[PDB]
Design brief:
The complex is a heterodimer of chains A (76) and B (317). With 76 residues, chain A is α+β, with helices and mostly antiparallel strands. Chain A has one domain. Chain A contains one helix and five strands; from the N terminus they run ββαβββ. Chain A is globular and about 35 Å long. Chain B is an alpha+beta fold. Chain B has one domain. In chain B, α1 crosses α5. The longest helix of chain B has 29 residues. Classes of the chains: A alpha+beta (76), B alpha+beta (317). At the A-B interface, β1, β2, β3, β4 and β5 of A face α5, β4 and β11 of B. The structure holds zinc ion. Zinc ion (ZN) binds next to loops of chain B. It is classed as hydrolase. The entry lists the keywords Deubiquitinase, hydrolase.
């Protein structure tokens, strides 16, 4: 199924995924397209940050669902 | 207490300014503070109950500053290592998600038990909005719509926009889905060029904006902070579905101070977040002082390493 990912520059990229793909698998697919290593990535869907170990099906992510890619600004 | 502002500071427990700045911004979002403080004694919201205890001390303590340790531990982001610096927007999103889910779950259980024997949460009411994406296949002209909830807008910087409105307009700008990003149309049963339109179908009571102040450098293979100054308006006109607009008043600004994305410090500017009380304050861990919108506007000009990251706006009635 084809989903959309909003990149760091606000561009929409398409990703071909399966409901059984884990969040880790989706991060690997984003690395393949954007070059961003998975440990930098945070993925947001409908306001929720997606958790490692879960699948797209766990979040009811389907064709045309949009995931938003964000990184981190660390502060203490 | 000790600050002549009448406000109470928060002790930093070891790289915890990312929590303190968020708690102060939420405390100053008046309608949310009221939701929290009015939570009935008999409730099934354990985390909101801990937040109400903390907000009680921020309202009534005679001490200059207090420790939010109990709430910080109860709301601890499980993938965060204590003592490591963290992203304040990541903590905020986790906190809102936890407060939403515990209330939603409680309501659902209560209703299902009653139905077996034969609504919206505070987070949804205060911070929830809706966005609709419409994809038009340029071959068959079918338009596929998808509505999704949000608690914030993640505002990307355009590829190498000077104002918040510029970033909001860019977030809502139409986009062509072409070449490597062609849309798979099931009516055409093939990849097709398409037009993507995004609209806000529901403006939230409090609009949370996160400025995506990071890029990924492909030469060094490292992320980098974006230090570009972005002007913040006191009054923002949020574009809504059908060419409509809704006025929003600035409530608070959470600033990340640091040259890089790997470390730094957070502080918050806020005024009362009730429907439009006009006094601005600067909250920096234990120290709270009177401040101004002039200081909010001066941030990056005076201190180039300091940049607004999370903004809170309240819908104008
Ligand atoms: Zn088509």
């Amino acid at each position: 199924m084809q989903i959309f990912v909003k990149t760091l520059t606000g561009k929409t990229i398409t990703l071909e995924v399966e409901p059984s793909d884990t969040i880790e698998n989706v991060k690997a697919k984003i690395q393949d397209k954007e070059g961003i290593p998975p440990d930098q990535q945070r993925l947001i869907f409908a306001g929720k940050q997606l958790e490692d170990g879960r699948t797209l099906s766990d979040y009811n992510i389907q064709k045309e669902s949009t995931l938003h890619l964000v990184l981190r600004l660390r502060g203490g | 207490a000790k600050s002549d502002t009448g406000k109470i500071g928060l002790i930093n427990l070891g790289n915890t300014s990312y929590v303190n700045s968020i708690l102060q911004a939420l405390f100053m979002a008046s309608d949310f503070r009221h939701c929290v403080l009015r939570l009935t004694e008999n409730n099934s919201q354990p985390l909101m109950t801990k937040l109400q205890w903390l907000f009680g001390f921020l309202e009534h303590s005679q001490r200059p500053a207090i420790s939010p340790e109990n709430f910080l531990s109860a709301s601890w982001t499980p993938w965060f290592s204590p003592g490591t610096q963290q992203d304040c927007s990541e903590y905020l999103k986790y906190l809102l998600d936890r407060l939403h889910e515990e209330e939603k779950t409680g309501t659902r259980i209560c209703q299902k038990l009653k139905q077996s024997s034969s609504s919206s949460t505070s987070v949804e009411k205060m911070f929830g909005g809706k966005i609709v994406t419409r994809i038009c296949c340029l071959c068959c002209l079918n338009v596929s719509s998808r509505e999704e909830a949000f608690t914030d807008l993640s505002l990307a910087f355009p590829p190498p926009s000077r104002s918040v409105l510029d970033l909001v307009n860019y977030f809502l700008s139409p986009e062509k889905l072409t070449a490597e990003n062609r849309y798979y149309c099931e009516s055409c049963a093939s990849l097709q060029d398409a037009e993507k339109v995004v609209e806000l179908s529901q403006g939230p009571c409090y609009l949370i904006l996160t400025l995506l102040r990071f890029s990924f450098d492909l030469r060094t293979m490292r992320r980098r902070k974006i230090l570009d100054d972005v002007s913040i308006p006191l009054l923002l006109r949020l574009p809504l579905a059908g060419g409509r607009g809704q006025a929003y008043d600035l409530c608070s600004v959470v600033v990340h101070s640091g040259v890089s994305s790997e470390s730094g410090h957070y502080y918050c500017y806020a005024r009362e977040g009730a429907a439009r009380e006009n006094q601005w304050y600067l909250f920096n861990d234990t120290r709270v002082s009177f401040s101004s919108f002039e200081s909010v506007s001066n941030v990056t000009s005076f201190f180039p390493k300091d940049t607004a990251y999370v903004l809170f706006y309240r819908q104008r009635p």
